[PDB]
Amino acid sequence: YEREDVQKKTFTKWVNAQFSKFGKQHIENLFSDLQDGRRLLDLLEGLTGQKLPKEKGSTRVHALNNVNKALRVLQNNNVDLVNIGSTDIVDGNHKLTLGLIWNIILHWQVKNVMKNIMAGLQQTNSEKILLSWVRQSTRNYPQVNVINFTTSWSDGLALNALIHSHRPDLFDWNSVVSQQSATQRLEHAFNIARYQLGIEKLLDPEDVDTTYPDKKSILMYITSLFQVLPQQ
């Protein structure tokens, strides 16, 4: 349940969702389009709201300066970072590029989205509180019993139940239960979240309806849902 090709795809979809939020250009390849250090600075500009000027020049030292600026901003935001140096990003290291993007997603999409609730509940484990939120929210949906952020989501019922429990107005639950295809249920939830909740479709059905669902991708998407669903 730690799947790196799926992570490449879904993390890139999240990065481009941020860029869509700010009207900037999308990236096409996560292991090439971050090397010059510019688009990382664009992403951190969008996330921090601060201007992060780029170095001028097309040599390796300018990319290294850009990435050093990005890493200094991350450390200034108390971000939990992987063991990384600027050269690892400039030179296209796959695992550490994925790991930096995951550090960013976890800091902003997960921890920061959930920070006020966690300070209220006086809890620190983000996964425990998010799992409890899903479980309590879907307690009265009988086809749903979420115990993890992987296989509990594969048949598409838990996602539709999480959406429905916070917005019972959007659809009739029995219409989803009557869908025998987990692909149709997953697409149904994805389309609701995309067009009625403003969440980019970070996940494909095959990223969830699969033998080993990627835990980080699902956690990312579920915390984005937590970010936009009403919890009055």
118 inside domain: no
User: Degrees (nearest 5) of the Cα angle 121, 150, 166?
Assistant: 50
Name the resolution in angstroms.
1.9
Cα-Cα-Cα-Cα torsion 80, 85, 88, 91, nearest 10 degrees, comes to 140
Looking at the fold, whether 20 and 87 belong to one and the same domain comes out as yes
Which residue range(s) make up the domain with 33?
4-112
Q: What is the DSSP string of 55-91?
A: PP-SSHHHHHHHHHHHHHHHHHTT----S--HHHHHT
Looking at the fold, whether 88 and 138 belong to one and the same domain comes out as no
Looking at the fold, whether 21 and 93 belong to one and the same domain comes out as yes
145 inside domain: yes
Q: What technique solved it?
A: X-ray
Q: Name the 3-class secondary structure at 210.
A: coil
Looking at the fold, whether 101 and 61 belong to one and the same domain comes out as yes
Half-sphere exposure of 225 (CA within 13 A, CB side): 30
